[PDB]
Amino acid sequence: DPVVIGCPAPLTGIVAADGIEFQRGIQMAADEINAVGGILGRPIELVFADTQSKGVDVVIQSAQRLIDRDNASALIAGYNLENGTALHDVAADAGVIAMHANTVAVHDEMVKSDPDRYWGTFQYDPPETLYGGGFLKFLKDIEDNGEFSRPNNKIAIITGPGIYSVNIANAIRDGAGEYGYDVSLFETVAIPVSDWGPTLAKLRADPPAVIVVTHFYPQDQALFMNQFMTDPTNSLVYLQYGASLAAFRDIAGDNSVGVTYATVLGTLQDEMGDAFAKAYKERYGDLSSTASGCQTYSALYAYSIAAALAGGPGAPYDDVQNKAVADRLRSLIFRGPVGTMRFHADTQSAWSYPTETNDPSLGMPHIFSQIFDKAEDGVLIAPAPYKKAGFKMPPWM
């Protein structure tokens, strides 16, 4: 009998572009796995539900449909525009596995709130908190390697009002002290930003060693750099998420050069990572996003290994067999194109390297990049052993 895998993804609405890549990624993994017989000779079938870039009610409806109507044994998502815990009760109540990369601390706390019940839901990246803790670790390593010499001990943190930006910003604020940084500014701005002037005046009145912007819109970030660069402070700049996108580099132009950014789950640029990216672009075109497609690709591979080891998926409501599958997933150490996927037992979230573990065979690399040319993707500068270059002092420093 075929193994039915359901994918609730935002195929329409404001984040359609990511939803389409989640669909492409999971299709590619299913095709590769099926070409060698599927899971224990059972072919993988994929059913999709469009969450329309809408919120909790629609995500739940979509997940429920995949189970009730399509008999999905497992749900695999990238992210959807929900708080992060919509899937847990849907999975638990149907005795199925759900995997997501919503990238949320609320997932960790939900699983910890009732681990006996929430045995089936896994977050296959680390929560967003690691963007903050991992930034501090990154900063330590480039200082220790001689690549960055702090002009002073001050860090400035600039956040939007939402939970993702705020959680990242507070992780950095809270951790700064043990790395010998004082927070010179913690600033919350209204979004979208029309003018960074007030923030920029505070920065220039008290030039920090490091500026972190956790507000993530690429256009707002480019406007920031264009206003910053009329009179830049002597500061390392890290921009959360948006700087990873062509749109940021297009709008900032040469002002993008020197900026750093990072992802807690991304394609490595070693042989295996390069092979995935090449194959993905051959299937879907050079403008397609491996950054989103690698997520559901990796998740389905992990699932396929765990389910095979357990003797196969359970049907909906076969809690005993799906618990066996979840046990295999919970102990899995799976090295794919994004690095090692391994779970914390207590949170059922991915281990992060080098922040939580010093061994890349035991956790997922938190990859940092630095822009060197407005026309190119940033170069990987952390963590060893995945660097393609070292951090280079920004041109404004």
TrEMBL record:
<dbReference type="InterPro" id="IPR019546">
    <property type="entry name" value="TAT_signal_bac_arc"/>
</dbReference>
<comment type="similarity">
    <text>Belongs to the leucine-binding protein family.</text>
</comment>
<dbReference type="GO" id="GO:0016597">
    <property type="term" value="F:amino acid binding"/>
</dbReference>
<dbReference type="InterPro" id="IPR028082">
    <property type="entry name" value="Peripla_BP_I"/>
</dbReference>
<feature type="domain" description="Leucine-binding protein">
    <location>
        <begin position="2"/>
        <end position="349"/>
    </location>
</feature>
<keyword id="KW-0813">Transport</keyword>
<dbReference type="GO" id="GO:0006865">
    <property type="term" value="P:amino acid transport"/>
</dbReference>
<dbReference type="GO" id="GO:0030288">
    <property type="term" value="C:outer membrane-bounded periplasmic space"/>
</dbReference>
<dbReference type="GO" id="GO:0015658">
    <property type="term" value="F:branched-chain amino acid transmembrane transporter activity"/>
</dbReference>
<protein>
    <submittedName>
        <fullName>Branched-chain amino acid ABC transporter, periplasmic branched-chain amino acid-binding protein, putative</fullName>
    </submittedName>
</protein>
<dbReference type="GO" id="GO:0015803">
    <property type="term" value="P:branched-chain amino acid transport"/>
</dbReference>
<dbReference type="InterPro" id="IPR051010">
    <property type="entry name" value="BCAA_transport"/>
</dbReference>
<dbReference type="InterPro" id="IPR028081">
    <property type="entry name" value="Leu-bd"/>
</dbReference>
<keyword id="KW-0732">Signal</keyword>
<keyword id="KW-0029">Amino-acid transport</keyword>
<dbReference type="Pfam" id="PF13458">
    <property type="entry name" value="Peripla_BP_6"/>
</dbReference>
<dbReference type="InterPro" id="IPR006311">
    <property type="entry name" value="TAT_signal"/>
</dbReference>
